[PDB]
Design a protein around this ligand. Sequence first.
Ligand SMILES: CC(C)CCC[C@@H](C)[C@H]1CC[C@H]2[C@@H]3CC=C4C[C@@H](O)CC[C@]4(C)[C@H]3CC[C@]12C
Ligand SMILES: CC(C)CCC[C@@H](C)[C@H]1CC[C@H]2[C@@H]3CC=C4C[C@@H](O)CC[C@]4(C)[C@H]3CC[C@]12C
Ligand SMILES: CC(C)CCC[C@@H](C)[C@H]1CC[C@H]2[C@@H]3CC=C4C[C@@H](O)CC[C@]4(C)[C@H]3CC[C@]12C
Ligand SMILES: CC(C)CCC[C@@H](C)[C@H]1CC[C@H]2[C@@H]3CC=C4C[C@@H](O)CC[C@]4(C)[C@H]3CC[C@]12C
Ligand SMILES: CC(C)CCC[C@@H](C)[C@H]1CC[C@H]2[C@@H]3CC=C4C[C@@H](O)CC[C@]4(C)[C@H]3CC[C@]12C
Ligand SMILES: CC(C)CCC[C@@H](C)[C@H]1CC[C@H]2[C@@H]3CC=C4C[C@@H](O)CC[C@]4(C)[C@H]3CC[C@]12C
Ligand SMILES: CC(C)CCC[C@@H](C)[C@H]1CC[C@H]2[C@@H]3CC=C4C[C@@H](O)CC[C@]4(C)[C@H]3CC[C@]12C
Ligand SMILES: CC(C)CCC[C@@H](C)[C@H]1CC[C@H]2[C@@H]3CC=C4C[C@@H](O)CC[C@]4(C)[C@H]3CC[C@]12C
Ligand SMILES: *[C@@H]1O[C@H](CO)[C@@H](O)[C@H](O)[C@H]1NC(C)=O
Ligand SMILES: *[C@@H]1O[C@H](CO)[C@@H](O)[C@H](O)[C@H]1NC(C)=O
Ligand SMILES: *[C@@H]1O[C@H](CO)[C@@H](O)[C@H](O)[C@H]1NC(C)=O
Ligand SMILES: *[C@@H]1O[C@H](CO)[C@@H](O)[C@H](O)[C@H]1NC(C)=O
Lengths: 344, 344, 344, 344
Amino acid sequence: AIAQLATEYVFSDFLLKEPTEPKFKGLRLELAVDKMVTCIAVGLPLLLISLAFAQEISIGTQISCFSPSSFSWRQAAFVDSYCWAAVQQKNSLQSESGNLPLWLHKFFPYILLLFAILLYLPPLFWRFAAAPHICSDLKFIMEELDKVYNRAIKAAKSARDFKYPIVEQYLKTKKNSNNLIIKYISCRLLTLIIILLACIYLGYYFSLSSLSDEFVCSIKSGILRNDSTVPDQFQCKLIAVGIFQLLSVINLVVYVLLAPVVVYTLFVPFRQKTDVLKVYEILPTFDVLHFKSEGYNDLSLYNLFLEENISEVKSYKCLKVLENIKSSGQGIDPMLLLTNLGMI
Amino acid sequence: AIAQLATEYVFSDFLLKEPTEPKFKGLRLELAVDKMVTCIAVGLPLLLISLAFAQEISIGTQISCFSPSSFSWRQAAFVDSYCWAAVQQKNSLQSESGNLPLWLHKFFPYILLLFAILLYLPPLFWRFAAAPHICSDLKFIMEELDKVYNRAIKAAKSARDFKYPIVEQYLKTKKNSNNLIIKYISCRLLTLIIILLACIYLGYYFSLSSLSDEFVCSIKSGILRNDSTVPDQFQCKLIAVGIFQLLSVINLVVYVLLAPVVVYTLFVPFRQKTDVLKVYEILPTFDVLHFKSEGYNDLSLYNLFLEENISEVKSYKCLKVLENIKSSGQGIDPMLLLTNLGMI
Amino acid sequence: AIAQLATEYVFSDFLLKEPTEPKFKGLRLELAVDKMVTCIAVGLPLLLISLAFAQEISIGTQISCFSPSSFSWRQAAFVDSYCWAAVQQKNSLQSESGNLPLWLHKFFPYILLLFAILLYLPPLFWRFAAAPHICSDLKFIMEELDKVYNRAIKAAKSARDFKYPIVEQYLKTKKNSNNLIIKYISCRLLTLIIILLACIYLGYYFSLSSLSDEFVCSIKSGILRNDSTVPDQFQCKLIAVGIFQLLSVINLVVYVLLAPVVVYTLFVPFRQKTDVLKVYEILPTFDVLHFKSEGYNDLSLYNLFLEENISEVKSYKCLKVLENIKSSGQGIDPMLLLTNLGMI
Amino acid sequence: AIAQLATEYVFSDFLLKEPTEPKFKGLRLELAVDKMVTCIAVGLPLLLISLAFAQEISIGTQISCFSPSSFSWRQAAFVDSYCWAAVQQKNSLQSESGNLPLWLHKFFPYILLLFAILLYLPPLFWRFAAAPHICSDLKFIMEELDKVYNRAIKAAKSARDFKYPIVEQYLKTKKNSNNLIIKYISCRLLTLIIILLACIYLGYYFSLSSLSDEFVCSIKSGILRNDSTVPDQFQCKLIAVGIFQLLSVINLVVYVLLAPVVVYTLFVPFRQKTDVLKVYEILPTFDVLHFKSEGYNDLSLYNLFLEENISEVKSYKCLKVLENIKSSGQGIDPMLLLTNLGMI
Ligand SMILES: CC(C)CCC[C@@H](C)[C@H]1CC[C@H]2[C@@H]3CC=C4C[C@@H](O)CC[C@]4(C)[C@H]3CC[C@]12C
Ligand SMILES: CC(C)CCC[C@@H](C)[C@H]1CC[C@H]2[C@@H]3CC=C4C[C@@H](O)CC[C@]4(C)[C@H]3CC[C@]12C
Ligand SMILES: CC(C)CCC[C@@H](C)[C@H]1CC[C@H]2[C@@H]3CC=C4C[C@@H](O)CC[C@]4(C)[C@H]3CC[C@]12C
Ligand SMILES: CC(C)CCC[C@@H](C)[C@H]1CC[C@H]2[C@@H]3CC=C4C[C@@H](O)CC[C@]4(C)[C@H]3CC[C@]12C
Ligand SMILES: CC(C)CCC[C@@H](C)[C@H]1CC[C@H]2[C@@H]3CC=C4C[C@@H](O)CC[C@]4(C)[C@H]3CC[C@]12C
Ligand SMILES: CC(C)CCC[C@@H](C)[C@H]1CC[C@H]2[C@@H]3CC=C4C[C@@H](O)CC[C@]4(C)[C@H]3CC[C@]12C
Ligand SMILES: CC(C)CCC[C@@H](C)[C@H]1CC[C@H]2[C@@H]3CC=C4C[C@@H](O)CC[C@]4(C)[C@H]3CC[C@]12C
Ligand SMILES: CC(C)CCC[C@@H](C)[C@H]1CC[C@H]2[C@@H]3CC=C4C[C@@H](O)CC[C@]4(C)[C@H]3CC[C@]12C
Ligand SMILES: *[C@@H]1O[C@H](CO)[C@@H](O)[C@H](O)[C@H]1NC(C)=O
Ligand SMILES: *[C@@H]1O[C@H](CO)[C@@H](O)[C@H](O)[C@H]1NC(C)=O
Ligand SMILES: *[C@@H]1O[C@H](CO)[C@@H](O)[C@H](O)[C@H]1NC(C)=O
Ligand SMILES: *[C@@H]1O[C@H](CO)[C@@H](O)[C@H](O)[C@H]1NC(C)=O
């Protein structure tokens, strides 16, 4: 039913499932905006496919040819099925709009499924190629941040009663390499191109005259070519073509609204803001150097992933509340850190 | 529905399920490229089979023979079913394209299922014959790497405050044996041959005239042979043949795009690059000798499997970050290793 | 659907499920070749049964008798159902090929299910009679091997810083008894005989003229015997008989390919090779005596089961890597064993 | 589908499910032969019921009466349904074989279900009445055996470096009481009687002329009794009667093969062999007295249950391997027991 389709595709965790494995425990591995874009671009065409053939919206068979009254039920059924299979056969049918509109009307669900698969492909390539590496690197970075926070609080407590910036060096090294950012931009660009092509196709499909679904059909090949009792042609109409056009314009609207989001996603350096690591600069055990901005490198992408999935880090949360309290400046950062006692 | 089939076969973990057993905990046991190739080559023909008979794309019955108006519904049904069963019986039907096109049109789903099964067979043979051995060997290798890393860090800590290369000897011994690599190449080659045969068949099927689905049928055997009221022949058409041809060309395109991937897979030594063990050479407890390249031996395959599923090793990750930091050369490898404190 | 059947029967763990109980944790209890043979011989006929009546391959009802035009729909339905039930009644129908072909055409699914059940019976008898005993014995043997390995490594460590061969005596005693091997050979032989009988039946079924599905039917018993308006006979055809013959020849090919595998399985002593226990002979705590070969006794079967499910034993894996390293001979077996430190 | 029914009823754990409760952890509570007999006798008739009405074997409706051509579809449907309901009404129909064959043809599924339920009743009575008691007693016996084995090995170890036979006294007391064995024999005898009655019924059903399914039907009661346009009688045939007879003879064959098994089961004392407790007689802490044989008492049944579910006992397994080694006599039983070190 329509409501069942809605529950499956919008109100359920459709493509929102976290990786089912212990390797990525709590790691999104995909930005929220990218996940939203993929979920829409994939589950919208599927939802429209399901809707267009819902038991309520669908009168019945997808084509009716209006055989003569003399024709029996199965003769008329032969006519309808023959014309359905003959939309491909150009000789059989003669339609003013041509045969491409008939092909599109017959295979619209296939085309929507193709667009959905093509849009799901780049996210899958990301999740299967560049996701494990970033997952491991980000897990190491979070562990290093937790360890340095613990060491700093232990030092502060000892004072009240190595020291090498490994994480900073690793981030600096990531500043050079760009394979991950190149893959990310390539997959986003392919998604954008697929969306644009889908928009072109949907606009063309919705621009039809709405009468191209009606085509003339001739069961006059073979032994029936010279038969007399059979009329030379029939009036066939492809039902649900109006529904297809409505859903196609809906998908076109959604995709044109979505494309600016993908374009904004492509410009990762601009998105790289609100320095996540700036909060850690007040730790004595952490060097006061952010050095993450203004670069078409994997460093900006790692900064984005950190700003996305750093809320799970207790040390980061503690430092964030310390920073927020520092806005008033009533107290002192080391005193607040010592009082917090948030090692684990 | 179409969307349900898509969710099952592309958006779900179809053939992507990890081995459901404690023996292989986190071990892929199959390269990512090989898994992708198998998943496509298997779940594409199944998806096309499901699509070709979807409740929306399917007008109804798969053949209609256009019985005379005088014929009753069940007489016409007898005609249609008789011709459906008589596509095999050459005498009954007379078609310009022959009888092989009719056989193919009737049994296209069976042929796609056969290709899917034949393509799934070599992966299954691998997973049931050569997977347990490589799993055990690779688990031992990872355990040995973890143990040697722990011993090296313990030695470094003791200095700050046996020694036999068992793993290196085991890898060197693997350099000689080649049964695993021979099995891998044989299964990949069989997959490639099956893909090529499927491409040949799909090209032949799509090259049909598109009118071979229309065949002349004669229910004139037995007591009806000399009956007069029955016409000497009927005009039967195999519905969904156009859909079969469309999906067959789609599968042909996918398989021709996939075959280069399989050929590239066959050349494992070329794939053997980015030495995974090179990072471990900086450990005092590990001998400085990689000795893994340029060989049609199981050593290259083991190197590939390591480069695939070594990200799960904390010691390997730590050594990798140490290597990446060494690019700048600001610090020292032993000092960084001591500061890391990543025993477990 | 066809794809659903494929997923259930070939791509899923159909009859590949491990024993659902804590008694056999990780124990196959069935050789890989035997499991493959049983899985094929059982799930192939079931798959063919499901395929032959798939919603796509099936035109509709399994028999159509072509009642006269004057006959109403339910009169024709009576004719068809009567002939379907009268394939058994020899007097009612008169077919050139006889009545056995009609019986076979009607009950082919039943015959395939019968063959599947008969082929599944010997494996079930094995798993319910001789599996618990071998499971317990093999678990004891693995525990003894682990314990002796632990004792030997402890002795080596003590030197660096009872002694009775219970397992060897148990294996020697198993050398005498042969009930398990006799049961194994009997079940394999029964499976082979069932496969041969199935091949005979399928060859006979596929050798039919292909026109035996068309039989003459007479609803002329009872009050209708002397009725005039009803024709003396009808032309009935059993639909799906061609599909049955195709699937029967497929099953015949599979079974003839499989029978050599079963024959090879029957010769267990030849299969008994690559001595698993030879690796343990280098342990000081283990006597240097294999004494397992060239016998129609349960010892060979136990050797096969060990070679099958010994990879799960850490001590065996360690000894195997020690053996492989010994190929070069660079080091020493006791030194390598001491350095391994693989007690648990 | 047929394959689905097979998977449910033969290839699945149909009635093979262990008690879903912590009270019986690993205790069969039912002998293997009895479980096999019950599973067959119950799931065979159910499987045949499902098969006889499978979507493939079933042409359609279960009765067709061949109404005149003048009759409309729903008039013919009224005729068919009336005759279906009138098989009971003797006046309406006049059949040569009588009315009992028609009753049986109509209610064969009900009769098979009745036999299945009646055969499942005694096993259920056992499992709900006499199973908890034997479970508790056998769990106590196994615990006592484990404790005495532990005490004996501890004594042997102490020597190398109460004593009352509670279990033997309990078994001796069980030698007197016979309520459990009486219940077991009664349930087995009732199962045998039900099987014999089912065989009688199936033989009678299969001995029919095969034409009793065709009966004459008269819709001539009420206002239609003196109606003229309606014929005085119709020719009705009960479809699937041949399938019923085939499946009934199959069930008859299975049950006649099974009855000897039940008779052999009834003679429990003969089955009481291969003394399970004989292995424990070599323990110093266990008295050398078996005293379990030649009795129509619960002791023999307890011996059977022990021989069935004693493999799960580590002490029993250890003593069994000691016994098997004693066949050669090379070593000594106490020395082997001390060396085993199998307390837990
Ligand atoms: C997904 C991508 C490939 C879709 C591409 C656009 C498709 C949907 C449409 C939009 C405009 C269309 C074209 C418009 C006009 C013509 C001229 C005609 O004489 C032949 C077909 C041809 C050349 C059409 C082919 C299909 C077309 C290119
Ligand atoms: C992503 C955004 C830009 C998509 C907006 C939809 C645009 C591309 C659509 C809307 C209307 C469409 C046009 C409608 C009609 C025709 C006439 C036909 O003979 C050729 C294609 C052509 C000229 C279409 C080309 C594509 C089109 C201009
Ligand atoms: C999967 C593999 C086996 C498929 C092999 C190719 C199949 C699909 C096709 C492609 C070309 C075909 C052949 C083309 C021409 C002829 C000549 C004709 O007089 C008999 C059939 C025969 C000999 C065909 C047999 C089937 C064929 C070989
Ligand atoms: C894997 C790649 C190479 C597959 C590409 C598809 C090729 C092999 C296909 C496409 C068109 C096909 C041809 C189309 C028509 C015919 C004529 C027929 O009488 C014999 C087969 C023959 C000659 C086919 C042979 C196979 C063919 C050449
Ligand atoms: C599974 C086993 C039992 C199958 C045995 C073979 C079956 C399928 C077939 C193969 C050959 C067949 C026989 C061939 C010829 C004849 C002669 C005829 O006048 C009576 C039937 C009889 C005697 C057939 C009986 C059934 C038969 C034996
Ligand atoms: C396991 C292997 C050997 C099976 C190979 C199939 C063999 C046994 C098949 C293939 C063709 C079959 C024959 C085909 C036709 C007939 C004629 C009939 O009147 C009697 C049976 C007989 C003679 C069949 C006997 C069995 C047969 C020879
Ligand atoms: C499950 C048990 C109760 C089944 C008992 C046997 C049933 C199936 C059958 C087998 C033989 C049958 C009897 C055979 C002959 C006659 C004589 C007739 O004039 C009245 C019915 C009567 C008396 C039948 C009654 C039903 C009967 C007893
Ligand atoms: C468990 C074993 C013994 C069952 C074997 C089936 C036996 C009991 C079957 C097979 C054929 C049957 C007979 C077939 C025909 C008739 C004639 C009828 O007027 C009375 C019942 C009677 C006489 C049946 C009695 C039961 C019968 C003898
Ligand atoms: C139909 O009849 C016409 C008459 O002109 C003839 O040309 C043509 O070949 C016939 N077609 C068939 C299929 O027999
Ligand atoms: C049909 O009638 C023809 C007349 O020539 C005859 O040859 C043939 O045998 C008959 N067929 C049947 C099946 O009776
Ligand atoms: C049908 O009529 C014939 C005429 O010869 C007669 O012999 C036969 O008994 C009748 N059959 C029935 C069932 O009344
Ligand atoms: C039918 O008509 C007959 C004429 O003899 C009469 O006896 C009978 O009562 C009538 N039945 C009904 C139900 O009116």
